[PDB]
Ligand binder design. Structure first.
Ligand SMILES: [Mg+2]
Ligand SMILES: [Mg+2]
Ligand SMILES: [Mg+2]
Ligand SMILES: [Mg+2]
Lengths: 164, 164, 164, 164
C-alpha cells in the first residue's frame, strides 16, 4: 500500500448505516459499531492520527470522537477537500499521503484527490467507483475498521504481537 | 421518464423500513436514512418540489421534513389520492405530472392514478405490482433516493456536473 | 385452510426481531413494524378478533396494542395455553379454531394445541418444527401480517375489494 | 462436548451486533435479543452458572444482567483472562472446564485458554479462527443462546422434557 500519514473519515454512512433516529422531543441518535474502535486502535498502533470530517454537527459525534480518542474532529464541514488540504498543510503532508473513506456526494471531490480512497459497499454507485481499494462491508458494519486494516496492511503477525 | 413536475412520497416503509420504536413513556422514534436527503437534493437541482403524504402525524416527521426543506407536508391524511388532487389543483398541475412512491394499502389508489408509481422491494406483492418502474431497494435503504434518481434520469454526467 | 375464530399472537420475536433496547436510565424500547397493522386490518375485515399473549409486561406493548385496537391483551402471562383456553371459553370456541403465532419456549405448549400454528423463520429449530404452515418472514419483518394473510386466505380479489 | 462448569460471555458483539446508540444528551443504549435469555435458561436448567466479563461499564448492562439473573457480572474489565482466572479460583474451577464466547481483541487471550472457545460469525477473522466450535449466528442474533445450546448439548430430548 501507499505510505499513509493521516486517515480521515466521514461519519454518516461509514461509521453508521446512514441511520438518523428522531424522537418526538427534538432529540437525535446515531448507532455506532464497537468494531470501528479497532480502526483507531490500529491507526494509533502505527503512529497514524485519525481525523473526522463531517457535514453534520452534533453532540452525538462529539461524544463518540471523545470516547475513541480521535485526533481531529471537524463538524459542519461545507467543503471537505478544503478542510483536508488545510489540515495537510498544518501537518506538513500532502493529499497523496492521506487515506479517506466516505460514502456520498459531499465526499466526492476529496475522494478523487487522496492517496487512498475508500467507499463502503452500501454507497451510491457513482461514489463507489471512486474507491481505489475494494471494501466488502457496508456503512455501520465495521467498514471503518476494514478500511484501516487494509490501508495499514494489518495482518495475523500484527494481531499476534498485540495480544501476547 | 415522463416530464415530472411534482414528486410525492409516503414516509413509513419508504423513508424507513417500517420501524416504529416505542418506549415506556409514550415517546416514539423513526429511523431515517441520510441517503434519502439526496433525493431532495436531486429534485431541487432539477426544479421540482417534493411533498410528503402520510397517514401518521408526528413531530418526528415534521422535524425531518424541516431539516430537508421538503416543500409540502401533509400528515394524518385519510385519503392520499384526494390530497394529491388538491395539491395538484393548488399548484395548478395534473396527477399525470406526478411521481409517487408508497408501500401499503393506503397508497394504492394514488399509485394507480399517477404518471410514475414507485413501490419499494419490501412492500406486499399486491402493492409491489402497482409500481411502474423497478425499484431494487427496501424501505429505509435509500429507496426514496433510488426513486428520484430513476424518475429524473440522474446519470454519471449529472454527477460529474454537481461535484466540480 | 381451517376455519379460524380467533387469532392470537406473541410479541417479542414475532412483532419484533427480539430486540430489547435498554438505556442508562431504566427505560426500554421495542421496534414494531407498521406492516403488521395490516394483520389487524385483515382480521377485523373478516370479523375475527385478535389477542396478544406475552410473558413480558410493558407500557410499550400496552401503547402499541391500543394504537392497533387489538381486541385482547394479556401480559405477564406465564401459562399461555391456559390463557388461550380461558379466552376460548369466553368466546365459546375451541382451540381447533384458534390460529396462534409464537417463536420460543413459552409458546410451545400452545402451538401444539391450536388449529393453525405459525412460527417465524427466525425461531429456534425445535419451535419452528411445530409450525403447521410455512412462514417465510422473520420476527419483526411483517411476519404477523404474513401469518394473518395466510390464515384468512387474503388474496388479490380481497385487495381489489378493499381499495375499491 | 467436554465437561463445562462455567459459561463466561462478553457483551458487545455477542449479546449485541456491536451497536452503540448515542443521543444528544449523554444517554446511551444497547440492543439485546430476547433469544439470548434462553441461553441463561438452559445453563441454569443444567446447573451451570453464567458470568459476564465486559470492558465497558454501563447501567444498561447491569440492569440487563440483573433481569436475566446472571450469576456473575464484571464490568470495566481490562484483562479478561485474569478476571476469569480469579473468578475460577474462587469457584474451584479450571479454565479447561470453562466455555467462553467473545468477538474481539480484548477476548483473544482468554479464548485461547478456555476449554471451549466460541466466536460469533460476525467477528474479525483473526478472532473467529480462535473459535474451537462453529457458531452460525452473528452478534445480536441469539449467538449466546447458540453457544450455550452447543456446549451443553441441548437437544430435542431436552426440549421435549422441559415442556410438560
Ligand atoms: Mg456520509
Ligand atoms: Mg407506508
Ligand atoms: Mg416471543
Ligand atoms: Mg465484544
Amino acid at each position: 500500500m501507499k505510505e499513509i500519514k493521516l486517515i480521515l473519515t466521514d461519519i454518516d454512512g461509514v461509521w453508521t448505516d446512514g441511520g438518523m433516529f428522531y424522537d418526538q422531543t427534538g432529540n437525535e441518535w446515531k448507532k455506532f459499531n464497537t468494531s470501528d474502535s479497532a480502526g483507531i486502535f490500529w491507526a494509533h498502533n502505527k503512529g497514524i492520527p485519525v481525523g473526522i470530517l463531517t457535514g453534520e454537527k452534533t453532540e452525538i459525534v462529539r461524544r463518540r470522537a471523545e470516547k475513541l480518542k480521535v485526533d481531529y474532529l471537524f463538524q459542519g464541514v461545507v467543503d471537505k477537500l478544503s478542510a483536508a488540504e488545510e489540515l495537510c498543510n498544518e501537518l506538513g503532508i500532502n493529499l497523496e499521503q492521506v487515506a479517506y473513506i466516505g460514502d456520498d456526494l459531499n465526499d466526492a471531490k476529496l475522494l478523487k484527490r487522496v492517496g487512498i480512497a475508500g467507499v463502503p459497499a452500501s454507497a451510491p454507485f457513482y461514489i463507489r467507483r471512486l474507491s481505489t481499494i475494494f471494501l466488502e462491508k457496508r456503512g455501520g458494519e465495521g467498514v471503518f475498521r476494514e478500511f484501516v486494516e487494509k490501508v495499514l496492511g494489518i495482518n495475523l503477525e500484527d494481531f499476534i504481537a498485540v495480544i501476547q
